[PDB]
Design a protein around this ligand. Sequence first.
Ligand code: MTE
Ligand code: MOO
Ligand code: MOO
Ligand code: MOO
Ligand code: MOO
Length: 444
Amino acid sequence: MQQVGTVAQLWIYPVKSCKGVPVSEAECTAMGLRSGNLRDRFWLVINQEGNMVTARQEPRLVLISLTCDGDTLTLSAMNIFEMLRIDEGLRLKIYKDTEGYYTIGIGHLLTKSPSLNAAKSELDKAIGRNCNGVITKDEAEKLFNQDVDAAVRGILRNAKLKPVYDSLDAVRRCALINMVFQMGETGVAGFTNSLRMLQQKRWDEAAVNLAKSRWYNQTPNRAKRVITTFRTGTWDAYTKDLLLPIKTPTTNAVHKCRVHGLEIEGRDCGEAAAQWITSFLKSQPYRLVHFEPHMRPRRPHQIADLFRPKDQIAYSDTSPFLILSEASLADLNSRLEKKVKATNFRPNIVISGCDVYAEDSWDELLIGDVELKRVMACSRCILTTVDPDTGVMSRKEPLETLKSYRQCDPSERKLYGKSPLFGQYFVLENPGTIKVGDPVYLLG
Ligand SMILES: Nc1nc2c(c(=O)[nH]1)N[C@H]1C(S)=C(S)[C@@H](COP(=O)(O)O)O[C@H]1N2
Ligand code: MOO
Ligand code: MOO
Ligand code: MOO
Ligand code: MOO
């Protein structure tokens, strides 16, 4: 009867622990959200023993997206960070770059001075400790995220690069950032003709012209990859996207998998998917499986007895739904140095227009014709610390901050123990469709 908020985002995470898919409408099913063929945690990566592989084991799973376009599923994993990792490589000790300048990490220039002392002083200043010329991969990734951020900041303040950048699609934007990271903003701003052809979408002409530059001559193999990316607008020069059919042949094997200790089947999605995931993670042999509706689902009441005996899920942790408010997220953000997005907490329904943590008090919600019933709070873990853009798991922000102020009340410590509360689990009371913009009504 009374409105307590509005749906602001809906997210489906088709493969467990991988990138969310934002949607404007979704059907609410007893097992979670569905948008056509994409259903929430209906796909799972497993190892050779059949055990789940989650972002706890492989934080780079958050980089992988499974999306659907009509007919075909696409698996894709590339973004600017991964593109530059491939092009810049990784060195944990000070080395000289190809122009003789001291550098470290992922292409991080320390100084143009010939003094190794100046390079070490710059390294200790940048990392904040006495490194003795050596860093950890985590520290290289920290410098790298700062360096990419600085390159995009630079493009957006540059009058010659900004209009090109803004005209480019998301993949070709990454090729322009890649150039700026390598050669700096002034250098890239100098390619007057190639920049013109890019802004005009004359991709073959721009590819031909950029291959005549001095850049190409100095690093032709890297230039050829950035060029292909501008020519095609695809990731064919890097981890190329894999296109699979929506329907998996029923001749493919059904595996007995284990998710959070409980058994569940999944139909193997085929060798191309397995090789693609394994290659990208550089891991032991993994497979991708998909839950089909005739398989026995997992039972949340076996995981937490507050759930009803009839509740069912495929591969999610515990619940068919997680709901979070924008208010709760803006709150945590007013306490954090590095800001986080709803994506860190993996909610399916994000609700705006309410007071902080209002969702903890919402026992029964009507959204459209969908009714949802609150079961319990979502208690948080290290998965919240995996950065969704870089795939790097941090040292516990934002978990530590959550820990400081969002613990469960002693009167309640048997479900949650100590693990901070951020988001609420819900189940379905009536099926239907929900849309971004739907008012949310608190019932009873
Ligand atoms: N639908 C749903 N969303 C959820 C949960 C859940 O059990 N069900 N658990 C949450 C927790 S605590 C975590 S760590 C992440 C795990 O996401 P994954 O299952 O895709 O790895 O989903 C979050 N959102
Ligand atoms: O092989 Mo290195 O230069 O320690 O990363
Ligand atoms: O003007 Mo260039 O430097 O032919 O792109
Ligand atoms: O951005 Mo384009 O001209 O459709 O390939
Ligand atoms: O960075 Mo390369 O392999 O010289 O083109």
